[PDB]
Amino acid sequence: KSPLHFAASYGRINTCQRLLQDISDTRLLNEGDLHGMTPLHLAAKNGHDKVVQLLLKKGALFLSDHNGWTALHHASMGGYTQTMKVILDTNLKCTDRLDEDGNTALHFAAREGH
Amino acid sequence: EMEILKQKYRLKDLTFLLEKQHELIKLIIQKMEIISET
């Protein structure tokens, strides 16, 4: 629940390895925050790559939160190139998605000047 | 000109140090024994 959001939000790899050993449990990862943010977006925002790749190996399905932002969008704000390369090599269909107004991942990367 | 130039290099060194320190603190959270307040 909330501890999962906290731990995945700050790169606690060992705790993640511990508390998502339930393969049949799927709905908890696809949960939402008050803003609907999914752990993927949190780890992309807070500078962490191992956790997001571990969740991706589970098949995170690339959820989209409010304001239309996605995992690549949040990863862009912060210039963490490693998460970009580990999230782009899986699929090229995750670059042209669009947020609530029309900005893409490139828009935000240019905005933050990385 | 050379004084502003010196200030620019000192500020570049300061921001490099602060970036390293921020990465270090992120290292601090990513391995923590958060149990009492977990």
Side-chain angles (χ1 to χ4, degrees), chain A residues 2-21 26-30 32-93 95-114, chain B residues 1-36:
Chain A
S2 276
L4 182 37
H5 285 78
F6 174 109
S9 192
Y10 297 101
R12 313 286 275 284
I13 313 107
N14 281 112
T15 279
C16 290
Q17 144 174 338
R18 265 180 187 182
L19 44 67
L20 319 90
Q21 279 320 94
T26 318
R27 295 97 152 169
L28 89 161
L29 164 155
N30 307 298
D33 196 21
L34 321 183
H35 316 67
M37 291 205 158
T38 290
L40 331 174
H41 310 89
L42 266 178
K45 264 284 268 199
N46 312 142
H48 299 284
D49 313 332
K50 293 308 164 32
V51 54
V52 68
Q53 79 94 50
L54 204 60
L55 306 160
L56 195 63
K57 100 186 281 214
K58 177 256 172 173
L61 206 87
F62 271 100
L63 319 91
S64 306
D65 86 310
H66 295 347
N67 327 310
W69 287 1
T70 51
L72 252 165
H73 285 119
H74 300 111
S76 164
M77 289 75 98
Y80 314 95
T81 84
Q82 332 81 337
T83 186
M84 331 295 278
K85 79 226 191 307
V86 307
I87 204 63
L88 208 41
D89 65 323
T90 165
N91 65 327
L92 207 42
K93 284 104 160 166
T95 174
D96 42 330
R97 55 209 160 169
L98 256 187
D99 73 329
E100 99 277 16
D101 47 19
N103 312 338
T104 81
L106 294 154
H107 290 78
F108 299 132
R111 206 205 291 274
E112 316 318 305
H114 304 280
Chain B
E1 272 87 0
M2 96 314 298
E3 191 80 350
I4 300 315
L5 211 153
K6 205 184 304 181
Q7 269 260 329
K8 171 202 103 158
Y9 289 115
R10 192 162 9 238
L11 217 30
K12 159 170 307 204
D13 229 22
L14 197 58
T15 179
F16 173 60
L17 212 41
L18 207 147
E19 279 154 84
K20 210 164 59 184
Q21 177 160 326
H22 164 43
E23 186 271 356
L24 211 159
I25 297 146
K26 287 202 290 316
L27 182 37
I28 271 158
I29 316 92
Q30 66 86 27
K31 276 176 191 293
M32 192 60 65
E33 47 278 352
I34 306 279
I35 172 64
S36 169

Short mmCIF file of all heavy atoms in Angstrom, two decimals, chain A residues 40-69:
data_model
loop_
_atom_site.label_atom_id
_atom_site.label_comp_id
_atom_site.label_asym_id
_atom_site.label_seq_id
_atom_site.Cartn_x
_atom_site.Cartn_y
_atom_site.Cartn_z
N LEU A 40 5.92 3.96 -10.80
CA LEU A 40 6.85 4.21 -11.90
C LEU A 40 7.14 5.69 -12.02
O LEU A 40 8.31 6.11 -12.09
CB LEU A 40 6.28 3.67 -13.21
CG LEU A 40 5.33 2.48 -13.18
CD1 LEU A 40 4.79 2.24 -14.58
CD2 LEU A 40 6.05 1.25 -12.67
N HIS A 41 6.09 6.51 -12.06
CA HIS A 41 6.27 7.95 -12.18
C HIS A 41 7.04 8.51 -10.99
O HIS A 41 7.88 9.41 -11.15
CB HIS A 41 4.92 8.64 -12.33
CG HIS A 41 4.04 8.04 -13.39
ND1 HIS A 41 3.16 7.01 -13.13
CD2 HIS A 41 3.91 8.33 -14.70
CE1 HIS A 41 2.53 6.69 -14.24
NE2 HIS A 41 2.96 7.47 -15.21
N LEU A 42 6.76 8.01 -9.79
CA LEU A 42 7.46 8.48 -8.61
C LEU A 42 8.96 8.21 -8.72
O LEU A 42 9.78 9.11 -8.50
CB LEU A 42 6.89 7.82 -7.35
CG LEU A 42 5.80 8.59 -6.61
CD1 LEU A 42 5.29 7.78 -5.43
CD2 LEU A 42 6.32 9.94 -6.16
N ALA A 43 9.33 6.98 -9.06
CA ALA A 43 10.74 6.63 -9.15
C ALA A 43 11.41 7.37 -10.30
O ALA A 43 12.61 7.66 -10.25
CB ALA A 43 10.90 5.12 -9.32
N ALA A 44 10.66 7.67 -11.36
CA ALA A 44 11.20 8.49 -12.43
C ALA A 44 11.44 9.91 -11.97
O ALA A 44 12.38 10.58 -12.42
CB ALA A 44 10.26 8.46 -13.63
N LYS A 45 10.59 10.40 -11.07
CA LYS A 45 10.72 11.77 -10.58
C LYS A 45 11.84 11.91 -9.55
O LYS A 45 12.45 12.97 -9.45
CB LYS A 45 9.40 12.24 -9.98
CG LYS A 45 8.52 13.03 -10.94
CD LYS A 45 9.04 14.45 -11.11
CE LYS A 45 8.38 15.40 -10.12
NZ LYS A 45 8.50 16.82 -10.55
N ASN A 46 12.12 10.85 -8.79
CA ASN A 46 13.01 10.95 -7.65
C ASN A 46 14.38 10.32 -7.90
O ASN A 46 15.10 10.02 -6.94
CB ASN A 46 12.35 10.32 -6.43
CG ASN A 46 10.94 10.81 -6.23
OD1 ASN A 46 10.06 10.05 -5.84
ND2 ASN A 46 10.71 12.08 -6.51
N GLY A 47 14.76 10.13 -9.16
CA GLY A 47 16.10 9.68 -9.48
C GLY A 47 16.40 8.26 -9.05
O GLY A 47 17.24 8.04 -8.17
N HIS A 48 15.73 7.29 -9.66
CA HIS A 48 15.96 5.88 -9.36
C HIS A 48 15.64 5.05 -10.59
O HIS A 48 14.61 5.28 -11.24
CB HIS A 48 15.12 5.43 -8.16
CG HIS A 48 15.42 6.16 -6.90
ND1 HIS A 48 16.54 5.91 -6.14
CD2 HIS A 48 14.76 7.16 -6.27
CE1 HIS A 48 16.55 6.71 -5.09
NE2 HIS A 48 15.49 7.48 -5.14
N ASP A 49 16.51 4.10 -10.90
CA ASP A 49 16.43 3.30 -12.11
C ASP A 49 16.23 1.82 -11.83
O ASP A 49 15.50 1.15 -12.57
CB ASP A 49 17.71 3.48 -12.93
CG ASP A 49 18.11 4.93 -13.08
OD1 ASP A 49 17.22 5.81 -13.03
OD2 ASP A 49 19.32 5.20 -13.21
N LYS A 50 16.87 1.29 -10.79
CA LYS A 50 16.72 -0.13 -10.47
C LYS A 50 15.28 -0.47 -10.15
O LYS A 50 14.76 -1.50 -10.60
CB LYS A 50 17.64 -0.50 -9.31
CG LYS A 50 19.12 -0.42 -9.63
CD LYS A 50 19.46 -1.19 -10.89
CE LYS A 50 20.82 -0.79 -11.43
NZ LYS A 50 21.74 -0.41 -10.32
N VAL A 51 14.61 0.37 -9.36
CA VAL A 51 13.23 0.09 -8.99
C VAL A 51 12.32 0.13 -10.21
O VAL A 51 11.45 -0.74 -10.37
CB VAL A 51 12.77 1.06 -7.88
CG1 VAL A 51 12.97 2.49 -8.31
CG2 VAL A 51 11.31 0.81 -7.53
N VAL A 52 12.49 1.11 -11.09
CA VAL A 52 11.61 1.21 -12.25
C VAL A 52 11.86 0.06 -13.21
O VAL A 52 10.92 -0.47 -13.81
CB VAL A 52 11.74 2.59 -12.94
CG1 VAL A 52 13.10 2.76 -13.59
CG2 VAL A 52 10.63 2.77 -13.96
N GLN A 53 13.12 -0.37 -13.36
CA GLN A 53 13.37 -1.52 -14.21
C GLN A 53 12.82 -2.80 -13.59
O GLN A 53 12.33 -3.68 -14.31
CB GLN A 53 14.87 -1.64 -14.52
CG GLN A 53 15.71 -2.26 -13.42
CD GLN A 53 15.91 -3.75 -13.60
OE1 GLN A 53 16.29 -4.21 -14.68
NE2 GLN A 53 15.64 -4.51 -12.55
N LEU A 54 12.88 -2.92 -12.26
CA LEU A 54 12.31 -4.09 -11.61
C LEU A 54 10.80 -4.15 -11.81
O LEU A 54 10.24 -5.22 -12.09
CB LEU A 54 12.65 -4.08 -10.12
CG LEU A 54 12.64 -5.43 -9.40
CD1 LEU A 54 13.65 -6.37 -10.03
CD2 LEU A 54 12.91 -5.26 -7.92
N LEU A 55 10.12 -3.01 -11.66
CA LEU A 55 8.68 -2.98 -11.91
C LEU A 55 8.37 -3.23 -13.38
O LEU A 55 7.37 -3.88 -13.70
CB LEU A 55 8.10 -1.64 -11.46
CG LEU A 55 8.39 -1.24 -10.02
CD1 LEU A 55 8.20 0.26 -9.84
CD2 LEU A 55 7.52 -2.02 -9.06
N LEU A 56 9.21 -2.72 -14.29
CA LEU A 56 8.99 -2.93 -15.72
C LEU A 56 9.10 -4.40 -16.09
O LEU A 56 8.36 -4.90 -16.94
CB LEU A 56 9.97 -2.10 -16.53
CG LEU A 56 9.62 -1.95 -18.01
CD1 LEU A 56 8.30 -1.21 -18.16
CD2 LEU A 56 10.73 -1.25 -18.76
N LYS A 57 10.05 -5.11 -15.47
CA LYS A 57 10.16 -6.55 -15.72
C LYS A 57 8.90 -7.29 -15.30
O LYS A 57 8.65 -8.40 -15.79
CB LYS A 57 11.38 -7.12 -14.99
CG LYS A 57 11.06 -7.81 -13.68
CD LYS A 57 12.33 -8.22 -12.95
CE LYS A 57 12.92 -9.49 -13.53
NZ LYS A 57 13.57 -10.32 -12.48
N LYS A 58 8.10 -6.70 -14.41
CA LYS A 58 6.82 -7.28 -14.03
C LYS A 58 5.73 -7.01 -15.06
O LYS A 58 4.70 -7.71 -15.06
CB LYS A 58 6.41 -6.73 -12.65
CG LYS A 58 5.06 -7.19 -12.13
CD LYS A 58 4.03 -6.07 -12.26
CE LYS A 58 2.63 -6.54 -11.94
NZ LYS A 58 1.68 -5.39 -11.91
N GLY A 59 5.93 -6.07 -15.97
CA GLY A 59 4.90 -5.71 -16.92
C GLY A 59 3.98 -4.62 -16.42
O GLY A 59 2.77 -4.82 -16.31
N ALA A 60 4.56 -3.46 -16.10
CA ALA A 60 3.83 -2.37 -15.47
C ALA A 60 2.71 -1.79 -16.33
O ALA A 60 1.86 -1.07 -15.80
CB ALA A 60 4.80 -1.26 -15.08
N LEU A 61 2.70 -2.07 -17.63
CA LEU A 61 1.65 -1.71 -18.58
C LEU A 61 1.62 -0.22 -18.92
O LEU A 61 0.76 0.21 -19.70
CB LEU A 61 0.25 -2.14 -18.10
CG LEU A 61 -0.85 -2.40 -19.13
CD1 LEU A 61 -0.79 -3.84 -19.62
CD2 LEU A 61 -2.21 -2.09 -18.54
N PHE A 62 2.53 0.59 -18.37
CA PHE A 62 2.68 2.00 -18.72
C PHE A 62 1.39 2.78 -18.46
O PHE A 62 0.75 3.31 -19.37
CB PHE A 62 3.12 2.16 -20.18
CG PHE A 62 4.60 2.16 -20.37
CD1 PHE A 62 5.25 1.01 -20.79
CD2 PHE A 62 5.34 3.30 -20.14
CE1 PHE A 62 6.62 1.01 -20.97
CE2 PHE A 62 6.71 3.30 -20.32
CZ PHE A 62 7.34 2.15 -20.74
N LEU A 63 1.01 2.84 -17.19
CA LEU A 63 -0.16 3.60 -16.80
C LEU A 63 0.10 5.10 -16.99
O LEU A 63 1.24 5.56 -17.08
CB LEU A 63 -0.53 3.31 -15.34
CG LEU A 63 -0.44 1.87 -14.84
CD1 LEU A 63 0.92 1.55 -14.27
CD2 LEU A 63 -1.53 1.61 -13.81
N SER A 64 -0.99 5.86 -17.05
CA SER A 64 -0.93 7.31 -17.19
C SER A 64 -1.78 7.95 -16.11
O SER A 64 -2.95 7.60 -15.94
CB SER A 64 -1.39 7.76 -18.58
OG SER A 64 -0.67 7.08 -19.59
N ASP A 65 -1.19 8.90 -15.39
CA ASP A 65 -1.84 9.56 -14.27
C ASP A 65 -2.58 10.80 -14.75
O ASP A 65 -2.71 11.05 -15.95
CB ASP A 65 -0.80 9.90 -13.20
CG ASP A 65 -0.12 11.23 -13.44
OD1 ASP A 65 0.35 11.46 -14.57
OD2 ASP A 65 -0.07 12.05 -12.50
N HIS A 66 -3.07 11.60 -13.80
CA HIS A 66 -3.71 12.86 -14.14
C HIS A 66 -2.70 13.81 -14.79
O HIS A 66 -1.49 13.62 -14.71
CB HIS A 66 -4.32 13.51 -12.89
CG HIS A 66 -5.43 12.71 -12.29
ND1 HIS A 66 -6.04 11.67 -12.95
CD2 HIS A 66 -6.06 12.82 -11.10
CE1 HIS A 66 -6.99 11.15 -12.19
NE2 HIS A 66 -7.02 11.84 -11.06
N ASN A 67 -3.23 14.83 -15.45
CA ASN A 67 -2.48 15.74 -16.31
C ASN A 67 -1.83 15.03 -17.48
O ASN A 67 -1.05 15.64 -18.22
CB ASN A 67 -1.42 16.52 -15.52
CG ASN A 67 -1.85 16.83 -14.10
OD1 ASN A 67 -2.95 17.33 -13.87
ND2 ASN A 67 -0.98 16.53 -13.14
N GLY A 68 -2.13 13.74 -17.68
CA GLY A 68 -1.69 13.01 -18.84
C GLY A 68 -0.22 12.65 -18.87
O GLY A 68 0.22 11.99 -19.82
N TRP A 69 0.55 13.05 -17.87
CA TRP A 69 1.97 12.74 -17.86
C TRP A 69 2.19 11.24 -17.73
O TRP A 69 1.35 10.52 -17.18
CB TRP A 69 2.67 13.47 -16.71
CG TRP A 69 2.81 14.94 -16.93
CD1 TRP A 69 2.37 15.65 -18.01
CD2 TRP A 69 3.42 15.89 -16.05
NE1 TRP A 69 2.68 16.98 -17.85
CE2 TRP A 69 3.32 17.15 -16.66
CE3 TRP A 69 4.04 15.79 -14.80
CZ2 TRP A 69 3.82 18.31 -16.07
CZ3 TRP A 69 4.54 16.94 -14.21
CH2 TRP A 69 4.43 18.18 -14.85
#
